Design a protein around this ligand. Sequence first.
Ligand SMILES: [Ca+2]
Ligand SMILES: [Ca+2]
Ligand SMILES: [Mn+2]
Ligand SMILES: [Mn+2]
Lengths: 234, 232
Amino acid sequence: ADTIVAVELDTYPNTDIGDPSYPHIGIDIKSVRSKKTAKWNMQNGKVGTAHIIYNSVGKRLSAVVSYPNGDSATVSYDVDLDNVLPEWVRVGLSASTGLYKETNTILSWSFTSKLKSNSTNALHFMFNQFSKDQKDLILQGDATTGTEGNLRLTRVSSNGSPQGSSVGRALFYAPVHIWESSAVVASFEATFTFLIKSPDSHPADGIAFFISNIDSSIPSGSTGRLLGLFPDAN
Amino acid sequence: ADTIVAVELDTYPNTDIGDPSYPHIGIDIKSVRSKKTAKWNMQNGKVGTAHIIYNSVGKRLSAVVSYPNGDSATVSYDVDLDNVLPEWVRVGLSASTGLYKETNTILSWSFTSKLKSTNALHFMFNQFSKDQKDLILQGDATTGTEGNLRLTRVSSNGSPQGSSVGRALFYAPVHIWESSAVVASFEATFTFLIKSPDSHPADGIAFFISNIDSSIPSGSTGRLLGLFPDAN
Ligand SMILES: [Ca+2]
Ligand SMILES: [Ca+2]
Ligand SMILES: [Mn+2]
Ligand SMILES: [Mn+2]
């Protein structure tokens, strides 16, 4: 039912639903099977940063993930999002664990959306420290805000261990007006920083930044490879 | 019950409840009787702009209202808002008509709030739409198709009705202070058109901050500006 555009940081290759055979960053347009992907070296226990950029003029959704040693992966995809998303949306962060696991810790998250006309309406928010009672965020599933200033999208246990089978998402409280047919420029950018750590045989499954219909919720059974985004793998 | 801080653009002197005896701008802290006021020359039928500014270091709430010919009023009041507002709030615009009446038309509205230890929230409407999904409209407030916000009832011929009250609040709660931030600041800006053919215009427009669940108090038309249950 939900309408999803996402950028996925995919730590685990599910080569049976069309992942490449390596960790990857992807652009997802109404499907977990990314329209475009690139090879990502996930750096275990290090803090990475993702940037996501779109505007309605070039109509190219782009993303880049990097670490402080300077290694980065990038991915771009040509798409007119006007023809994909409702005019009003909510923006959010998603994460999963499945059979393998990992911390999915958000340390910071910022977002800007603008409509400029013919003829500016704007929304911008920036979290660099989350609080225990984040009244601006809609937490779904296992997602907690802690007292340590962080957003934990998936269940971690009191000794700091990540759990399997977990799914969590945080959405900004106010609906966003992503497009407006008489805006000449409708643009958005998002940025988050994240710590993925695992002592496991392999890390799974990743974190996503997403945009959806306003009333979006975690689809039934979207742990593991579905990243809390999609009711299935089609 | 509600906690209110407001800057009021007060077009009508109610000298019994402490207004000065001229149209005025005021700083209202938990009371319709302003802690501070300044004389304001409302220009009928002209587009005015109001700027409001606060930071937790100077601890001075300030406001200026101007018109394009460049006449302006200003008011400042020294107050630690940490001691007066909940940590979480909603921000919004309010207006009234009573026995006299006016258009209370908002043409644009922007807001910035920052906690630097930065968390930040900023919005800016230069055009409002029919279905404004990030705004909570209360009482008589509508967003029209002309890009404007009408805080008070206007009739199909474009006439302001009396005995009207309306507010718009931004949809997201705002985290206005955080005891461990060194600077918490905010401002706000809005542009407005007050028009009346009436014997006197009444009653004005306010920018306000309140508890997150604030609603129009019972009977807060006319001189209470949709902000206060009474005139204490
Ligand atoms: Ca995968
Ligand atoms: Ca008055
Ligand atoms: Mn993938
Ligand atoms: Mn007054």
